[PDB]
Amino acid sequence: PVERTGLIRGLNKGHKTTRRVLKERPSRRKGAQSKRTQFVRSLIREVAGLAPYERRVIELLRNGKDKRARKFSKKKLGTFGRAKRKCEELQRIIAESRRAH
């Protein structure tokens, strides 16, 4: 950790204390992928397939309309970041399909 300057204003302001590094709290471990979760999620993907709007975004990304796919994903999902994550996940899906074929 960066040592504080001991000032009331400016960069790194605050009273000087000896900072400690802590063991990572297990509550903050959420979001990490596990082997069981990864295997189950991949198998469930193979069992179930894709949504109709997911297939539409697949078609747009195969056709090369990346901005149109991002716009359609944002319209469907409601969030630009979620649209970007869905688009990159479908890039991974298309890449795996191409490397399989």
Where along the sequence are the contacts to RNA (CB under 7 A)? 4, 13-15, 17, 19, 24-37, 41, 51-54, 75-82, 84-86, 89
Name which position in 2, 9, 64, 81 contacts other proteins (CB under 8 A): 9
What's the distance, Cα to Cα, between the start and end of the chain in Å?
Answer: 49
- Residue 62 and residue 49 in contact, taking contact as beta carbons nearer than 8 Å: no
User: How far apart, in Å, are the Cα atoms of 12 and each of 2, 6, 22?
Assistant: 8, 8, 20
Binding region for other proteins (CB under 8 A) out of 12-20, 57-65, 66-74, 90-98: 12-20
Q: Which has the closest alpha carbon to 87: 41, 62, 37?
A: 62
Of 18 and 33, which CB lies nearer to other proteins in the complex structure?
A: 18
Q: Nearest approach, Cβ of 66 to RNA (angstroms)?
A: 14
